Design a protein around this ligand. Sequence first.
Ligand SMILES: NS(=O)(=O)c1cc2c(s1)S(=O)(=O)N(c1cccc(O)c1)C(CN1CCOCC1)=C2
Ligand SMILES: [Hg+2]
Ligand SMILES: [Zn+2]
Length: 258
Amino acid sequence: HHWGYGKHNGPEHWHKDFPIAKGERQSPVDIDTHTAKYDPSLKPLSVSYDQATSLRILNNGHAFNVEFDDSQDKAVLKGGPLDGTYRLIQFHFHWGSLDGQGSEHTVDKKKYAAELHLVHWNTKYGDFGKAVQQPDGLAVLGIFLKVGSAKPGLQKVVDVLDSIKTKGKSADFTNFDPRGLLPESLDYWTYPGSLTTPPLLECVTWIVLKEPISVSSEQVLKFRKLNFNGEGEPEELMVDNWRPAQPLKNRQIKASFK
Ligand SMILES: NS(=O)(=O)c1cc2c(s1)S(=O)(=O)N(c1cccc(O)c1)C(CN1CCOCC1)=C2
Ligand SMILES: [Hg+2]
Ligand SMILES: [Zn+2]
């Protein structure tokens, strides 16, 4: 009928409509810290989120997304393993029904409670739709969320979820500052991969941050109260919207730290 994360249309079934699911550079993967190569030539990451304009938040039946105005270079990502400027277009989360699962990427087989993806596209390509047609079209900055203390920067997002409860609802979400979702250190691992949901396009340079952010259980708890279904349909709680780790194949994960 259409992809989802349940018994009948979950990740295991995705390959039927999206053949690329069994490709060479699929994500997410398991980061084995003892095999990752320290690379002294990688540049430090440069995140310029000082003029970001958030527009709205919407429930799309797969997760919730905060969209930004990417008409010009207001919020960008440069440095690290990248070439050229990438524009912030949207961020979303993946989470679980329990605190010991939720993240897509794992560290030494360790699963975190949730995972934040800040999606950017390569400006040299003109618009998002063109960028998705290239090997170095996307750069997704991933951050792990660990349950502990509350993150002030996340509360604004948490407070508005009630107005976008079911599939297809949206609420205006202006003046949100993304810099509030960053950890202290910008150290990372990097590898060539893909989107973690259909169409599963292999156009992503993944930059996973080493240091996770803290989020209270009450904050994550509100994520689990969202709905996969639209208004009027039977209720199905939005939880465990994450894809299992894929085989690394012939790839190498470089670390920007020792
Ligand atoms: N989890 S993830 O980081 O690996 C991403 C999954 C998707 C990302 S990133 S996305 O931002 O690139 N894109 C997306 C999602 C919501 C809004 C938007 O403008 C784009 C879609 C749906 N998208 C339709 C057009 O072709 C590519 C895929 C899925
Ligand atoms: Hg691509
Ligand atoms: Zn994602």
